[PDB]
Amino acid sequence: TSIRETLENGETRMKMLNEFVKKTSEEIDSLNEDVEEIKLQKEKELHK
Amino acid sequence: SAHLKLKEMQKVLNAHRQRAMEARSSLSKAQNKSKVLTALSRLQKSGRI
C-alpha cells in the first residue's frame, strides 16, 4: 500500500511536471515570436 | 438676403459638421475596439502577463 501510494504520488508529480514543461515551452515559443516581431519592427521602422 | 442665404448655408455646414463628428466618433470607437482587440490577441498570447 505504501509503495502504491508512492507510485501514485510520483505519477501525479510527473504529470504535473509534464504539464508545467508544456506550458513553459508554449511560453518560450510565444516569447521567441514576440522577440522576432520586435526585431522585425526595429529593422523596418528604423529605416526611415 | 445675401447674408441671409449665407447664414442659411452656414447652418447647413453646422449640421454637416456635427453629423461628421458623429460618424468620426463612431469610427474612433470602432478603431479603438480594433486596437483593443489587438492587445487582447497579443498581450495574452505572449504569456508575459
Short mmCIF file of C-alpha atoms in Angstrom, two decimals, chain B residues 10-44:
data_model
loop_
_atom_site.label_atom_id
_atom_site.label_comp_id
_atom_site.label_asym_id
_atom_site.label_seq_id
_atom_site.Cartn_x
_atom_site.Cartn_y
_atom_site.Cartn_z
CA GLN B 10 -23.67 78.05 -42.87
CA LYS B 11 -26.39 76.46 -40.75
CA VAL B 12 -26.23 73.51 -43.15
CA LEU B 13 -22.47 73.40 -42.55
CA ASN B 14 -23.07 73.17 -38.80
CA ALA B 15 -25.40 70.23 -39.39
CA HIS B 16 -22.84 68.55 -41.64
CA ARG B 17 -20.19 69.39 -39.04
CA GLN B 18 -21.95 67.67 -36.17
CA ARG B 19 -23.06 64.72 -38.28
CA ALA B 20 -19.48 64.29 -39.47
CA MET B 21 -18.33 64.37 -35.85
CA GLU B 22 -20.92 61.68 -35.13
CA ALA B 23 -19.51 59.43 -37.84
CA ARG B 24 -15.97 60.31 -36.74
CA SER B 25 -16.82 59.48 -33.13
CA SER B 26 -18.26 56.11 -34.15
CA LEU B 27 -15.21 55.44 -36.33
CA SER B 28 -12.91 56.29 -33.42
CA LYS B 29 -14.83 53.97 -31.11
CA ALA B 30 -14.67 51.26 -33.76
CA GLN B 31 -10.95 51.66 -34.37
CA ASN B 32 -10.46 51.88 -30.61
CA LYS B 33 -12.04 48.47 -30.11
CA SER B 34 -9.98 47.22 -33.05
CA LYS B 35 -6.66 48.15 -31.47
CA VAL B 36 -8.01 47.00 -28.11
CA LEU B 37 -8.64 43.62 -29.73
CA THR B 38 -5.01 43.62 -30.88
CA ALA B 39 -3.90 43.81 -27.25
CA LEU B 40 -6.37 41.04 -26.39
CA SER B 41 -4.74 38.97 -29.13
CA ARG B 42 -1.15 39.97 -28.38
CA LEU B 43 -0.67 40.59 -24.65
CA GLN B 44 -2.46 37.36 -23.75
#
